Design a protein around this ligand. Structure first.
Ligand SMILES: Nc1ncnc2c1ncn2[C@@H]1O[C@H](COP(=O)(O)OP(=O)(O)NP(=O)(O)O)[C@@H](O)[C@H]1O
Ligand SMILES: Nc1ncnc2c1ncn2[C@@H]1O[C@H](COP(=O)(O)OP(=O)(O)NP(=O)(O)O)[C@@H](O)[C@H]1O
Ligand SMILES: O=c1ccn([C@@H]2O[C@H](COP(=O)(O)OP(=O)(O)O)[C@@H](O)[C@H]2O)c(=O)[nH]1
Ligand SMILES: O=c1ccn([C@@H]2O[C@H](COP(=O)(O)OP(=O)(O)O)[C@@H](O)[C@H]2O)c(=O)[nH]1
Ligand SMILES: [Mg+2]
Ligand SMILES: [Mg+2]
Lengths: 651, 651
């Protein structure tokens, strides 16, 4: 019920015409069509259609539902065809690299983020997932230009993070009239409205932008409350996500139980265009000068926590930790993260930051291969594959179709890239390692060091062929200061950092950033592994499937029965305090709510030194409480995390 | 409790500084300040402060509430100061014309529309009331550019009429995705949202745009329903006004009880860029070609009437009558009217049409001066004053501050102007003429002929000094075809049209259009006369004042008492079927609901031949019914009215 020969499938796709309209609607690009036809034999015979049986029933139905291209609502592309198309879309004329990417992706070593999977090798190749946008100016012209931009971006795949620190707060003065300003909320309501009007890619799910405000902005209280399902209606913005861009001085005032001061950006200019001490200097001076409204820090705090407890938002991202520890610091002051709090990239009115994403599948490197029946981890294959994905994401930068000029400007200047991971929890389980074990802690550090090292090396090789990126000179990287150096730490040492730093100083790197582990929400589901780097949330998930690693074990112990089936549904996928189940299994299959959030922050802190950018650290709290949240926020803060919190997931 | 010397008042205004902010906020322009100081003696001694006692208690409190400039919430300008400032803002260095305009305005011969009163002689002189905007393109870029434009326009005084015939309808195809379009409504919802976010001038009342669609657009049914207070919520747009831009062919299909066909503009291009026969030719061809959805004309009809009955909207404006009979026809096809259905001016993506407005006060020309105690009408003073206002509106064009480039382009090319009137009903009453009398019918024709003639002559003189307007060549006017010629009628003849046409053909006119009688909602209330050209809606209005002409008469007849007071409140200001009241009085003070709508359309049809543009014809129906509305719509249509209906006012 789908044509088999690949080039025949391309033919159809490429020759498509929309019957309702009589318009030719080719779904393959010219340049990719040509490549395919010019190499039809090599390409056709390289595919291995058994590999379609690598996908779980749920894995495949995800692919089927919205990934594999359709001709008149009918799926016309086999999973292998999707992959082959992707590999071509990325690799163009370089058939060898294409062919390499094909095998590895089909073998499920890694995958590319959804935009790539959707649009690679199609005429409008928009393979980018992230856009961080700057509010252009505190004017009606600036506001509507940015609005126009978000709409144009939203037309295609990819989420937006938008920062709005420069917008005049409620009641602020306006030259030329006696009218006074209305603040962020009415304006937020405009963005929200545009988010709902512009389809993403052309389908069901709404626009969703994330909004970045620094907690001193005079409209903060309402801003943080944007997602509440009560109060009024016209004070909310229920399709957007508030994200706090928090400076240390705030955390400090909260801790010391002191005061916080709210400014309108026009009474207190420059607050967001600096960080660390210069910021505190400037902020304290403005406070002295009575340009704002002072209140007790802990009153803002307490509000911030109420919102997180109810909505899981705002997210928290530490402005200082982000700017102090960015390889982009030479470009200027970074003003926001993105929609999923993983990207940390400079943006300006004329530079909208972009990022391409792929995820290495960590389980694929477990080989129970030595002799007996221990497993090891093949960190050599991890390095190799990590290098390939680096090269891929880099190719994507050039072949990408940018939705707006400020995106193309930004990407061609700095070439940031984003690697991350899926199936950490799987690797751990397969390796008989409890998520909170000293062994798992070692493995985390190790996996991440090796990806960072790999991608930095592969990027170094690139710089050697195509020159460093335009803005390499002046970077921490160009001075020998890599990610972990900015954490005042020594790398674990599994790889040779001296030689790499040596080369990097000599030849540069092609990419300003490389690592930003992301949520993997849908691309982990295709491959059949757990979300990114978080532990399982349940052993039962939901049409209800028992954890295959758990299940396997329950059988070998001849204890899997009806009570064991139904207990898992009762106890929502938890095996703790369950009568006939060994301590080994109990430790290994703790749900995420059963692991200390201190351990999570620890391992997050551990891998963070090999992360160029940030990672989407979700927090999970079972029995939620002000004080409990407070110690999780501050704990992470002091660890020097960038993304202190993505969602607060609860119940 | 307000400084008296005028130049002192300017001084304060001009020297103002906003204390909260420490910013200098001058409220007079540089060039006007200089003029004032350079002529302080002439200017100070020309004012006559008794004239402040020309204003009724309600008249003055309107002026006080939002017209006279304030210094720290405290009124600092006397009505005479407002006027003097206006006359200067219009007339600049020409002190004689300034001084002329001052006397006439203070004497209440005429006034300028509210934007003028608000901003003349201030630093951001935006004295324009009307903007007709073109939807830039059926793209997300075009949509958001227009949105940006409406916002920038809304920043200052003046209402918008926006036409959207070129936007792709629900479910229409989009190249580049499998997504399908969502039609006008979601997009309308975006405009609506911007209308509420951008304050007008800087105060309370919401943005309000009027939206112009041709009834064949495939989204018509929902479009016409935009103002209903039920159904759903997300299908409505309750801060905008739908206006039908109706072609004859529709009226015809409705009458002949035939079919109507709905097209998306992309399946049926060019429909709005033509009119009359070429349109019917093109439309019928598209129908034959099955590019649309056909339904029974009378089903659309019946829906259109349900909406008017409930919401008083959509307005009706006949596209063909507008284009066939416009002096702007040489410019291209006019695609919309404005917010109050009086302006009929060409617009394009790069030309947003503008208009300045003043209203002659018709009562001021009644002089009971011959000998005995008949009154006459001084049509010679009407001609004179009408000429002055022409010159004024023309000066305003040059001294105006345009909110966007497409407005400045449009106005400097064609220089349209807009005269109208207030206190028709007053003139009639003062002259002992029932609104529906053959005498009142004669006076209407007469008043309007004389304003048209006057303004055309005064504009001719201008063309002689400053050249014709850029696009005069090719105009009906340049061929000797004036307004009434396009109605295939001969003018009443009270003035010498041969000589004027002769001169116009020779020298041109400065303005492409001159006459567009408007609602006068607030500027008739300042002067203390009834709205524009409509009859009184009540003799009692509302803190309740009895019609002074009625009241006067009731006293001289010694019949005004308690029963007469309270009867008027009971019968909502109607004197019909009331026991001790002469037939003379009953005929003279019919409320508007007591006058045949056929008579209204007649007199509207009568003055329409001296109207360059259109006029805001409100319809009043007491006992509303499908068939009754139907005969009022068709009656007006056949009379060749442009604005068939502004609001349907009911109850
Ligand atoms: N009519 C209006 N309605 C609502 N908000 C407005 C309006 N005018 C300005 N603002 C807000 O005020 C800020 C300044 O807008 P902008 O258009 O730059 O003002 P401006 O007229 O140039 N005056 P200023 O910026 O004070 O010199 C922006 O954040 C706008 O959102
Ligand atoms: N992602 C989207 N969501 C909602 N409406 C859209 C989207 N993309 C396009 N439209 C509508 O489709 C029409 C065409 O938009 P435009 O941006 O010109 O499309 P395009 O991508 O250039 N394709 P086309 O115009 O069909 O050649 C406009 O009326 C838009 O309102
Ligand atoms: O629902 C979503 C999820 C994600 N993203 C974007 O994709 C990035 C990572 O998303 P994720 O890994 O969850 O999606 P995947 O690539 O696996 O499909 C984010 O930073 C967003 O910019 C988005 O636009 N909508
Ligand atoms: O509430 C209003 C009424 C009017 N207008 C604009 O002003 C013109 C005429 O308005 P009107 O005569 O009623 O107002 P006035 O000039 O008397 O204050 C219309 O065509 C609109 O463009 C507006 O923006 N808001
Ligand atoms: Mg400004
Ligand atoms: Mg287009």
């Amino acid at each position: 019920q789908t044509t088999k020969q690949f080039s025949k499938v391309v033919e159809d796709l490429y020759r498509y015409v929309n019957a309702a309209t009589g318009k030719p609607a080719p779904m393959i690009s010219d340049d990719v069509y040509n490549i395919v036809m010019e190499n039809k034999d090599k390409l056709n015979s390289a595919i291995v259609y058994d590999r379609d049986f690598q996908y779980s029933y749920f894995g495949f139905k995800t692919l089927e539902r919205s990934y594999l291209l359709r001709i008149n609502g009918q799926v016309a592309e086999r999973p292998q065809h999707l992959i082959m198309r992707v590999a071509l879309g990325i690799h163009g004329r370089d058939i060898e690299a294409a062919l390499e990417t094909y095998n590895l992706m089909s073998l499920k070593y890694f995958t590319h983020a959804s935009p790539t999977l959707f649009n690679a090798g199609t005429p409008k190749p928009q393979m980018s997932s992230c856009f961080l946008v700057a509010m252009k100016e505190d004017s009606i012209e600036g506001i509507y230009d940015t609005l126009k931009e978000c709409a144009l971006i939203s037309k295609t795949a990819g989420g937006i993070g938008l920062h709005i620190h420069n917008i005049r707060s409620t009641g602020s003065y306006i030259a030329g009239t006696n009218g006074t300003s209305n603040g962020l909320i009415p304006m937020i309501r405009v963005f929200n409205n545009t988010a709902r009007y512009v389809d993403q890619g052309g389908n069901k799910r709404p626009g969703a932008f994330a909004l970045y405000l620094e907690p001193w902005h005079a409209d903060i209280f309402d801003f943080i409350d944007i997602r509440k399902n009560h109060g009024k209606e016209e004070i909310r913005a229920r399709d957007l996500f508030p994200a706090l861009w928090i400076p240390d001085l705030f955390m400090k005032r909260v801790e010391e139980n002191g005061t916080w001061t709210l400014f309108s950006p026009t009474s207190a200019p420059g607050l967001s265009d600096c960080y660390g001490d210069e910021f505190e200097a400037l902020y304290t001076r403005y406070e002295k000068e009575g340009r704002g409204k002072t209140i007790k820090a802990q009153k803002l705090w307490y509000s911030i926590l109420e919102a997180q407890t109810e909505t899981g938002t705002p997210f928290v991202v530490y402005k200082d930790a982000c700017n102090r520890k960015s390889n982009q610091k030479n470009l200027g002051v970074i003003k926001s993260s993105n929609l999923c709090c993983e990207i940390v990239e400079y943006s300006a009115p004329d530079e909208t930051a972009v990022c391409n994403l792929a995820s290495v599948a960590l389980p694929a490197f477990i080989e129970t291969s030595e002799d007996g029946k221990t497993s090891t981890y093949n960190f050599k294959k991890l390095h190799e594959i990590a290098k390939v994905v680096t090269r891929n994401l880099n190719r994507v930068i050039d072949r990408n179709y940018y939705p707006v000029e400020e995106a193309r400007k930004s990407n061609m200047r700095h070439r940031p890239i984003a690697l991350g991971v899926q199936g950490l929890a799987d690797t751990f389980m397969l390796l008989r390692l409890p998520f909170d074990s000293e062994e798992a802690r070692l493995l985390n550090i190790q996996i991440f060091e090796t990806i960072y090292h790999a991608s930095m090396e592969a990027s170094c090789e690139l710089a050697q062929k195509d020159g460093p990126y335009e803005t390499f000179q002046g970077s921490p990287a160009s001075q020998g200061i890599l990610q972990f150096d900015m954490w005042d730490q020594k790398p674990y040492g599994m790889w040779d950092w001296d030689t790499l730093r040596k080369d990097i100083m000599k030849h540069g790197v092609r990419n300003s950033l490389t690592m930003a582990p992301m949520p993997t929400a849908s691309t982990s589901q295709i491959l059949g592994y757990n979300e990114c780097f978080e532990p399982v949330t349940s052993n039962m998930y939901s049409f209800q499937v028992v954890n295959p690693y758990l299940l396997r074990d329950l059988v070998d112990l001849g204890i899997w029965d009806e009570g064991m089936k139904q207990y898992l549904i009762t106890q929502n996928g938890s095996i703790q305090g369950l009568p006939n189940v060994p301590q080994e299994l109990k430790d290994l299959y703790k749900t995420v709510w059963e692991i200390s959030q201190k351990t999570i922050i620890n391992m997050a802190a551990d891998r963070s030194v090999y992360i160029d950018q940030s990672h989407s650290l979700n927090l999970f709290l079972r029995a939620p409480t002000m004080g409990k949240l407070t110690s999780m926020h501050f704990y992470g803060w002091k660890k020097g995390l960038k993304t202190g919190m993505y969602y607060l997931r609860t119940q």
